[PDB]
Amino acid sequence: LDAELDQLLQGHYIKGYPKQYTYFLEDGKVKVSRPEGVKIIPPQSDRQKIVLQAHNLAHTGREATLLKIANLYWWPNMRKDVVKQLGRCQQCLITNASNKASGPILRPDRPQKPFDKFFIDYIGPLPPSQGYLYVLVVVDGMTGFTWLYPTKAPSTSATVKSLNVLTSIAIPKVIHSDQGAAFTSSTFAEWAKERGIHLEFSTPYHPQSSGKVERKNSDIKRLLTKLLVGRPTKWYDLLPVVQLALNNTYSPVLKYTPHQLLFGIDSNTPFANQDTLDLTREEELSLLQEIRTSLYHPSTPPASSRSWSPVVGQLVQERVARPASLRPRWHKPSTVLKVLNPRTVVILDHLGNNRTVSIDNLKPTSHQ
Amino acid sequence: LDAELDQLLQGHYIKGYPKQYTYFLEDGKVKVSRPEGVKIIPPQSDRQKIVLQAHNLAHTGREATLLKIANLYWWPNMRKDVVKQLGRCQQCLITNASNKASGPILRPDRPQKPFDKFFIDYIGPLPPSQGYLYVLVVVDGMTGFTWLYPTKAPSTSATVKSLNVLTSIAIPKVIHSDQGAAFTSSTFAEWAKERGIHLEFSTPYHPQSSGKVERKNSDIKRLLTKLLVGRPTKWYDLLPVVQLALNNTYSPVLKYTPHQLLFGIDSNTPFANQDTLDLTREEELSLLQEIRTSLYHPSTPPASSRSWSPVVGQLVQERVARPASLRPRWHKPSTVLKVLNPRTVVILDHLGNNRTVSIDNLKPTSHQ
Amino acid sequence: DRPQKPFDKFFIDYIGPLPPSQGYLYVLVVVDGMTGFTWLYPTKAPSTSATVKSLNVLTSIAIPKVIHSDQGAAFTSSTFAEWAKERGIHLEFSTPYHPQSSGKVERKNSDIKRLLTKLLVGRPTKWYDLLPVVQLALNNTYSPVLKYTPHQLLFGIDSNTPFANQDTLDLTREEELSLLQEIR
Amino acid sequence: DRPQKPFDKFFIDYIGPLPPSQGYLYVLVVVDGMTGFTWLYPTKAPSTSATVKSLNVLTSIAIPKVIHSDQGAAFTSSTFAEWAKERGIHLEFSTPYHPQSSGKVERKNSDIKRLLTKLLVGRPTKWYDLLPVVQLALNNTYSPVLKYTPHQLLFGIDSNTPFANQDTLDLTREEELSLLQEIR
DNA sequence: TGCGAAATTCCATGACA
DNA sequence: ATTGTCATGGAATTTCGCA
DNA sequence: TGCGAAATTCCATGACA
DNA sequence: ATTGTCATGGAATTTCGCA
Ligand SMILES: CC(C)N1C[C@H](C)n2c(c(O)c3c(=O)n(Cc4ccc(F)cc4)nc(N(C)S(C)(=O)=O)c32)C1=O
Ligand SMILES: CC(C)N1C[C@H](C)n2c(c(O)c3c(=O)n(Cc4ccc(F)cc4)nc(N(C)S(C)(=O)=O)c32)C1=O
Ligand SMILES: [Mg+2]
Ligand SMILES: [Mg+2]
Ligand SMILES: [Mg+2]
Ligand SMILES: [Mg+2]
Ligand SMILES: [Mg+2]
Ligand SMILES: [Mg+2]
Ligand SMILES: [N+]
Ligand SMILES: [N+]
Ligand SMILES: [Zn+2]
Ligand SMILES: [Zn+2]
């Protein structure tokens, strides 16, 4: 502080203060004559307070804060002291946006068999039809075969009624859902356990994770839309038609319909494929197993040039889910406990709970 | 039709029917033995009806429609007949998504002088503060200097009261706004004409066009957020503070504050820049004019590999603005009258009105 | 002739009246000829209307080329015939008083009745809830004649509920004297 | 000594009472020393409170290093002095009964009073609405001594409202006999 | 053994609250 | 404790029909 | 006439309803 | 008849301090 600045005035050399400039006293303040002009060198014990006043004017980041300070002051390594404060401003940390993209998505292996994994979700509220408001959508992970159920509410009891009808056909190993009330209720958990079904949940507010069923929702709404053009939106009676229509539609990349992947033979629907007419059912189920294992599988795309990847013990912040008006978009900083995979982490949250979370719903806390 | 298919059976050659395959009669239907298997050749007069039934099952696009037809049929150039129908399906055309990106954005010249162009917009509803709900934001195009006005409603009368206070300082040549009710009212038009101000409107539902003020909104909300952390959202009293704070904040790319660009000298605010202390006001306004003309200007970025560009007389469709549940996202096809620039067009809309529209709110109608 | 396939022929039929379960009285029985797979639907009556309502559900999953039944009024109505024609299903009737299926179907329909009878004693009223597990049992029951269950033949994979406990299916001396009391 | 600059010194002062306009009675007059730029604010009273409320608006646009005024009660209150200190503004008072500005400011303040007087006759009540156009006139009025208008000196550009019609600013014989009637 | 055109495959775009 | 997906229609590439 | 480190510049990211 | 913008903080590049 005053120690350093005294030595400096009597022409001694201090590290960080380049000797080639002339440092002097004026108005009771140490000054230096810099190419930009004459600037005040505040004592070290003064510097934190200057940075803070500078920063607080508008809660500016590195450069804009520096530029204010540089108007009046100079000292060695200012940005280091600037950054020091930015890393300590609770308000900046929880309000600012991230500027690093997530690592490239994973493309999980397609479930090997029909009934290995169901993806499920609600669509709605839709306009009332027969006093129904929602649709339960169930998509088999392997085939993309889909079941549609109209419900009055996205409730556990409606979900249970629906799945009882579906599970009459077969029981799935796993059902995957987002964390909607209907799926996280303990009533639903009992119902699953009763049947030896494992429940698997998406990281919260990250519907990409339920991408199989989400993507199918789109198709469902799309078809419903086309069918209802110029009519009132009476969709209840259409659900069966949509179900059948979609399950029997080709995916140009696969060259198969969901029904074909499920049954290995078209039922009596229009333009039924007749290629296996001469094979026995046994020869047919044989070609089917072969088809099932050789389906195209996409691979993880290139990283963006500014992606970030989670490391154990790193400070990260969770995105606030339904942020109120004028409230920060980010929770307080928290710590990465485990890296489940390059796109999913468990964090300890200052409360501190364990939370399993998508990297897309995180940012790495800036300035360490 | 029956003509063509008769010639074909007796071993004659018809264009489009490769001679190397054996065509025969069976069940009263012309068949051909194709590498994929035996397929029926329907008479030309039958083909449109087949494509349509195929297509209608799920309103599928090219490949998925073709794959259904190919199960039962063959004829020359099927996809041509497939595409023919897709271009005629009103429902597909107005419901499907586009798969071509817009051409790369324009970066319009920065208005040359303060007061050449104002960009204006409302933010809100915000939580009530002193019974105020909205903010009128006014951004000078050249400087980015900003004026903030709290209003009870995004109304013409509130806008008029506000601009009367602002225009006391100076009158702008042009005011640019989106097409919010407040700005498009004829009361507002009178008010502008009275003062020789030209009103310039964004293409509808394309706030990029008001990007100067929109971007400033973000900053405004951001600062308000930071200031209100842990307090109730009493923002009314903060507007002045935010105004001053933002107008005096550096843009690291420019190295200037909006106030500096407006006045060429800092007023008595913290960390005021002192570099021109020895210049006369006249020398100062001279350096200012120089600064103003040499500010960094961004250039139009590279096109995406699948962008489309509007051509006069082309069928295009306007995006529906606030589409209802289960209703198409696109209006009926319309015609490009004039190409104002590579990113803006005038279309005649089937009603038919002239509409000036952003390319981002258009798609080129598929299959011509 | 081409080998027999799933969806080639559905065998349909009603079972009831039964003791009211959630205001249901009948069960519409659908069995795929080739795989022996069974679907059950509870109805309030053996009417054309209830048949249509039920098969509307099934045929939004898979459509048979041919449906076969006896000459039940429900199935011989011209309403049911319009329905089938709309859907491109050929209807096939067995001659009156002489029902014909196949060995496989006859046996399956026997099991169903036998299985139902077994579980509706002790709880003649809880059957509506039980339909799902009846179906799973029936469909994951091993076929003596073919090496496989209907599940396996329909989907070409093992099931996640293998019913290894091939039951008695017969009535215990408890259940015998209990079913003679519900009548008496 | 360093050359004189905008925001170096604001000269403030009140004008009134005036005839009620939208329940306003006074005008707070702010003139930048160097540029001669004028800001006007209508108040209900020449109080510290109304001064603070008004200057709060101005100083959210630009803050003067020094404010100068006479010894009005409004300006000599310790409330106004707390306010200025918070904002880092030095307050400067002219000695009582002897107001001192500069040639430029004195002349500007003369114009303002003269201009106001001119337009409030015929419509002594419509002045609230007129403040904006008074300011534009004042600020786009050519300075004999310097080559430029306040607008030009403040912003370094020409204005979009050049007031080429440098008016009479004097009272017509109509306006003279009209202002002797509002009093009488 | 190479041509023009038709078929197929590729793949960015966008939307699933 | 978990993880994007896939219809779409121009463009790009490959294959076909014929020689 | 070249080194290590500090300063500056670059620039993808994301959000303005 | 009109048209994106620009704070942000790591990384990349350039400049500085010294020799
Ligand atoms: C309340 C319960 C837990 N819920 C919470 C979240 C709202 N959610 C669902 C849900 O079904 C969907 C969606 O279909 N989409 C649309 C979507 C967007 C991108 C994508 F890749 C796929 C789908 N977003 C959703 N959101 C999570 S967002 C991103 O809005 O926070 C949700 C829930 O059921
Ligand atoms: C009702 C009136 C005409 N209005 C209609 C539209 C809604 N709008 C405004 C408005 O102020 C804003 C926005 O600030 N943003 C946010 C934004 C999004 C992207 C971007 F680059 C900048 C800003 N979107 C808006 N929209 C046009 S969207 C894209 O939602 O249709 C609008 C209007 O005042
Ligand atoms: Mg959901
Ligand atoms: Mg969803
Ligand atoms: Mg707006
Ligand atoms: Mg806006
Ligand atoms: Mg019978
Ligand atoms: Mg006075
Ligand atoms: N996986
Ligand atoms: N421009
Ligand atoms: Zn901060
Ligand atoms: Zn269609």
PDB file of C-alpha atoms (C1' of nucleotides) in Angstrom, chain B residues 21 61-62 99-100 306 366-367, chain F residues 7-11 16-18:
ATOM      1  CA  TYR B  21     -38.595 -56.540 -68.616  1.00  0.00           C
ATOM      2  CA  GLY B  61     -44.012 -36.322 -48.234  1.00  0.00           C
ATOM      3  CA  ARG B  62     -42.193 -37.618 -51.278  1.00  0.00           C
ATOM      4  CA  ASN B  99     -36.622 -26.863 -44.675  1.00  0.00           C
ATOM      5  CA  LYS B 100     -34.750 -23.970 -46.241  1.00  0.00           C
ATOM      6  CA  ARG B 306     -29.452 -24.318 -47.677  1.00  0.00           C
ATOM      7  CA  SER B 366     -42.651 -26.619 -52.116  1.00  0.00           C
ATOM      8  CA  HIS B 367     -42.946 -28.521 -55.380  1.00  0.00           C
TER       9      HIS B 367
ATOM     10  C1'  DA F   7     -40.228 -36.139 -41.613  1.00  0.00           C
ATOM     11  C1'  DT F   8     -39.082 -33.228 -45.171  1.00  0.00           C
ATOM     12  C1'  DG F   9     -37.776 -31.745 -50.120  1.00  0.00           C
ATOM     13  C1'  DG F  10     -34.009 -29.856 -52.923  1.00  0.00           C
ATOM     14  C1'  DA F  11     -29.127 -31.278 -54.033  1.00  0.00           C
ATOM     15  C1'  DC F  16     -30.231 -47.889 -64.581  1.00  0.00           C
ATOM     16  C1'  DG F  17     -31.183 -48.527 -69.501  1.00  0.00           C
ATOM     17  C1'  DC F  18     -29.097 -48.828 -73.470  1.00  0.00           C
TER      18       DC F  18
END
